[PDB]
């Protein structure tokens, strides 16, 4: 149905995302159980990790477009990522390695992430109708890999240990690399301009030096979240100051602030909603016992099923408003499940968490899939920098917010943890409802400004 290189990119993307979500799915639990972090420390350290993973994506589009070439930067990103996964597996022998290894994943992700999508765009003549479908299948690829990883990685970590899990993350990257190298012939005429001139060793060295520097800076920020906080505050206030000095941009600003709220909520899946499933939900659904950490897999599950349907099925600000209302309902549903529909021992039906994640995934499908594509219709390099900066800030804020659900290690009664989750999730749902309403009110004015 699609060009042959589409299937190469599909499977490279699938396996790379498998590696990443294999780590993401178990990391907060790894912080608590293996490194002995409190839930509070684990949640804020995960927040810093997620911020760097997301904020560094800005580098890889630039590196691929202008320094080394899209295909070369796919190869380099894949290698740095696999190195990071094996380093994480090695952190169990050498615990002092952990932050450097996670920073290597962050920098590796930064180099890799923007580039497969870029390549896929060049597989089609410029106004090809199949583009829309191909990109929906690309997103589905991301979420099939994520689905497999969030499903299987906690089970693997429970049965064989973290070293095995992280090494398999690395192996998934190695097999992304093998599938790319085996398929190189499919993309001989596909690439950015640097792909077709000889590689500049000068720029390659600049990219490796900066990468290593960034790996160390990431390790540091993640070990010392209290200064990452101030770094991002001063960076945010400064880039806001310089954005205000320099009106289709004002619409980009309000849409960015709304995206920040969305990412604060998205950040809860591996942290507060994860420990909510652990502590206050039954770990049995349709008669099968499951690892509760696997409940995170419900997000890609619903994306995998819902992206075709919603592809079959106002315009920008109204899609954003709807997504914000969906997210609001996910958290109000979590709160409602805890307040009214819990067992006498404090446990709630897993169908409520299935519904929380359906709502949250629909919110994702309206906002982040459809965000920077026509944030790109309103606009430049500066706003990409500001976008990634603010969303990294959003992930830090999300870790901090998750800490309000943190449970001490000595608590064992679900009736003690249930009101904490319920208070926080209900308050999140109410604030997101207020935000969704203000978004709705501004939808007409926002939609006027786009003309």
């Amino acid at each position, epitope marked *: 149905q699609q060009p042959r290189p589409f299937f190469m990119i599909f499977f490279v993307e699938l396996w790379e995302r498998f590696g990443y979500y294999g780590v993401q799915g178990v990391l907060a639990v790894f912080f608590v*159980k293996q490194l002995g972090f409190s839930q509070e420390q684990a949640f804020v350290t995960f927040g810093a990790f997620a911020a760097l993973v997301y904020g560094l994506i800005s580098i890889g589009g630039y590196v691929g477009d202008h320094l080394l070439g899209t295909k070369r930067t796919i190869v380099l990103g894949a290698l740095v990522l696999a190195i990071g996964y094996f380093m994480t597996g090695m952190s169990l022998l050498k615990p002092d390695l952990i932050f450097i290894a996670l920073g290597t994943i962050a920098v590796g992700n930064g180099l890799f992430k923007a580039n497969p999508a870029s390549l896929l765009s060049k597989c089609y003549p410029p106004k090809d109708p199949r583009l829309d479908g191909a990109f929906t299948l690309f997103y589905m690829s991301i979420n099939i890999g994520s689905l497999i990883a969030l499903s299987l990685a906690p089970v693997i970590a429970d049965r064989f*240990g973290y070293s095995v899990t992280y090494n398999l993350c690395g192996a998934g990257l190695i097999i992304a690399l093998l599938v790319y190298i085996a398929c190189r012939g499919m993309v001989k005429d596909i690439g950015s301009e640097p792909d077709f001139r000889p590689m500049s060793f000068s720029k390659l060295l600049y990219v490796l030096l900066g990468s290593v520097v960034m790996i160390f800076v990431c390790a540091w920020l993640m070990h010392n979240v209290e200064v990452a906080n101030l770094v991002l505050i001063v960076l945010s206030i400064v880039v806001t100051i310089i954005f205000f000095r320099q009106n289709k941009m004002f619409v980009a600003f309000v849409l960015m602030l709304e995206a920040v709220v969305f990412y604060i909520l998205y950040a809860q899946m591996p942290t507060s909603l994860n420990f909510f499933a*652990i*502590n206050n939900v039954h*770990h049995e659904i349709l008669g099968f016992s499951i*690892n509760p950490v696997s409940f995170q897999a419900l997000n890609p599950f619903w994306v995998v099923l819902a992206s075709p349907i919603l592809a079959g099925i106002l315009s920008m600000p109204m899609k954003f408003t709807l997504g914000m209302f969906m997210c609001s309902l996910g958290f109000l549903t979590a709160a409602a499940a805890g307040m009214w529909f819990a*067992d*006498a021992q404090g446990l709630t039906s897993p169908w409520f968490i299935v519904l929380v994640y359906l709502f949250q995934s629909l919110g994702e499908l309206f906002i982040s899939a459809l965000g920077l594509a026509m944030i790109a219709a309103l606009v430049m390099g500066f706003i990409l920098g500001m976008w990634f900066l603010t969303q990294a800030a959003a992930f830090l804020l999300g870790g901090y917010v998750a800490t309000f659900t943190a449970v*001490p290690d000595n608590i064992t009664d679900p009736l003690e943890t249930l009101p904490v989750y319920t208070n926080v999730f209900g308050k999140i749902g109410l604030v997101t409802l207020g935000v969704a309403v203000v978004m709705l009110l501004m939808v007409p004015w926002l939609k006027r400004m786009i003309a």
Partner: nanobody
Amino acid sequence: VQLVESGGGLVQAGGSLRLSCAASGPTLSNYAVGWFRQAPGKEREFVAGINWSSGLRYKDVVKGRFTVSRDNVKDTVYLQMNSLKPEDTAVYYCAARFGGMLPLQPSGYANWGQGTQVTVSS
């Protein structure tokens, strides 16, 4: 996923017994392990447990007599039962739930040992 209990038996009032729970494939370290007991003609009731991070929970009538502990090297959970009484006679089960919570009812636990008879004679 399957727990093996060991260490039951018959003991006189005021004596002591130790139960142990071990798991096959999954490392027990990630699990709250609760000990339940069923006396003749009554329901399983929570007795005592340790969560995945050394937090403890006890039924009121066994406090000051029972101690739950964990040897994370041997991947085993222990119930040390001192000052035993006739009304402690029951089948004892260990049960395992992922995470930090020790819910009071059997339905909170997915994995169950087969049960060990503990009898305390007057």
